[PDB]
């Protein structure tokens, strides 16, 4: 049985992307400090321990699942699109996610808020005419007070409906005070939608929408994600495990149940 690792994860021959201090999801939404991972690509994406978000407090229900779908696709290729928001103020941002000189937010997201006196009943539609699936990512904002709710979106209680021809998610914000994070008792909630060719993404809302900036090109799940604090070395090795590289010469390995590449069976 193979029962020992070098201890390092060899940089060759699979394209290994070290996220350093960004997890995948943070690099995906576009946490200011993961701006470097933009449009990046990999076979194996290793998430370290350091990893800490550092932008608007958010929670992703169905995280581990959304995390895996992206990890598999192995590309982080974002494609901006021409969304048309008429009647609201775009580019919203905050101090909990500073960028440049001040207020910032997730690069891949667009915070809409009222335009002076009002927040119209938004209702855009964007058709997927292409020959590949689209993975839009959006969010809903939950102010922690009815004051905040009204300052930003006017309406006393918002709603976000993101429908395609086969689905229909209608989430409604939930006002209340959550634990303080980077000075905030507020939060955003990340949701997603994959649009199959010949389908139409339809965003209708009248409050709290945290609009998509475009879509993520999705290829076929050949790549994978893995958490490990293993160093990365310059060497050639085919079987990668959270513990490091282990040779695939023996038929059974007992090092770890998680591995990448032509590996010995786990025992």
């Amino acid at each position: 049985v193979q029962s020992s690792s070098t201890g390092k994860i060899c940089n060759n021959p699979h394209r290994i992307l070290d996220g350093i201090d960004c997890t995948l999801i943070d690099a995906l939404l576009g946490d200011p400090h993961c701006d470097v991972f933009q449009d990046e690509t990999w076979d194996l994406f290793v998430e370290r321990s350091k990893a800490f978000s550092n932008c608007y407090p958010y929670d992703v229900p169905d995280y581990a699942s959304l995390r895996s779908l992206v990890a598999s696709s192995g590309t982080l290729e974002f494609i901006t699109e021409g969304f048309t928001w008429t009647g609201v103020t775009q580019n919203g941002g905050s101090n909990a996610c500073k960028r440049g000189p001040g207020s910032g937010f997730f690069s891949r997201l667009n915070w809409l808020i009222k335009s002076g006196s009002t927040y119209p009943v938004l209702d855009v539609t964007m058709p997927n005419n292409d020959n590949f699936d689209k993975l839009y990512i959006w969010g809903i904002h939950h102010p922690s007070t009815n004051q905040e709710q009204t300052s930003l979106y006017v309406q006393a209680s918002g709603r976000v409906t993101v429908s395609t021809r086969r689905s229909q998610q209608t989430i409604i914000p939930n006002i209340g005070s959550r634990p303080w994070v980077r000075g905030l008792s507020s939060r955003i909630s990340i949701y997603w939608t994959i649009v199959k060719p010949g389908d139409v993404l339809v965003i209708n809302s009248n409050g709290n929408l945290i609009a998509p900036r475009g879509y993520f090109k999705m290829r076929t799940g050949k790549s994978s994600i893995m958490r490990s604090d293993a160093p990365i070395d310059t060497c050639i090795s085919e079987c990668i495990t959270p513990d490091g590289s282990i040779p695939n010469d023996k038929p059974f390995q007992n090092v770890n149940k998680i591995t990448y590449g032509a590996c010995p069976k786990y025992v």
Partner: antibody, heavy 122, light 110 residues
Framework: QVQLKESGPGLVAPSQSLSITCTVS????????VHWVRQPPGKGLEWLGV???????NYNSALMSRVSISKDNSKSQVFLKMKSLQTDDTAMYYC????????????????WGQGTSVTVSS | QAVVTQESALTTSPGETVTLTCRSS?????????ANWVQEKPDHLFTGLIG???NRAPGVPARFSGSLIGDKAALTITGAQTEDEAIYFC?????????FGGGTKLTVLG
């Protein structure tokens, strides 16, 4: 950096139509609003109206019947159009950026333009 | 919409602590009004000073402070210097309509 410049006529005769232009740089019109403030010689300032990032506008009740603010988001230009001009309109015309803080929730006029003088004389 | 009123001119000397004020015909000046304090320097080159009543704008020296003093808004130069001579305009927000004050001429006897 933020930056706003006004370019207009300088001299227009009573009963014609005033057309100033505030060309903004370093921020998008879909990200902020732009205000119009006029200062007649030896007087206080006067707020003319505002065009929000959403395009909707809000004018000063008084002059509203003659004012009209617009904008071409793709050119980074806001447009103050005044008709039925009368001598009193001689003043400095300024455009200042509308700012809103998302964390404390307050409005403010942060970036003022350099201004452009307009004399209404026949 | 309403009428913002403030001192015509005020004359201080270097060192002293002056306080321009900003009144509302329509009542007390609440936080709802977002008292804005613009500073007009020579040859009308306006500059933001304080916004939302007390939020000091970046360049603005620490010595300028925004506050509510009773039912009117205020600005307090603490230790005025000759370079504080200027017309200080107060602006009050009333429902998607701004309303400036007459402006105060501040003299700093030098």
């Amino acid at each position: 950096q933020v930056q706003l410049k006004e370019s207009g006529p300088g001299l227009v005769a009573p009963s014609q139509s005033l057309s100033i232009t505030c060309t903004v740089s370093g921020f998008l019109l879909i990200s902020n609003g732009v205000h119009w403030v006029r200062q007649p010689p030896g007087k206080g300032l006067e707020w003319l109206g505002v065009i929000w990032a959403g395009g909707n506008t809000n004018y000063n009740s008084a002059l509203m019947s003659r004012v009209s603010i617009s904008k071409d988001n793709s050119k980074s230009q806001v447009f103050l159009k005044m008709k039925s001009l009368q001598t009193d309109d001689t003043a400095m015309y300024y455009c200042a950026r509308d700012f809103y803080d998302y964390d404390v929730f307050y409005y403010a006029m942060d970036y003022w333009g350099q201004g452009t003088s307009v004399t209404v004389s026949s | 919409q309403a009428v913002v009123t403030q001192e015509s001119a005020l004359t201080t000397s270097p060192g002293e602590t002056v306080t321009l004020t900003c009144r509302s015909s329509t009542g007390a000046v609440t936080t709802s009004n977002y008292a804005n304090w613009v500073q007009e320097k020579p040859d009308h080159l306006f500059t933001g000073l304080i916004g939302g009543t007390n939020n000091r704008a970046p360049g603005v020296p620490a010595r300028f402070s925004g506050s509510l003093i009773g039912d009117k808004a205020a600005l307090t130069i603490t230790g005025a210097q000759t370079e504080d001579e200027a017309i200080y305009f107060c602006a009050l927000w009333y429902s998607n309509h701004w309303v400036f004050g007459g402006g105060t001429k501040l003299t700093v006897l030098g």
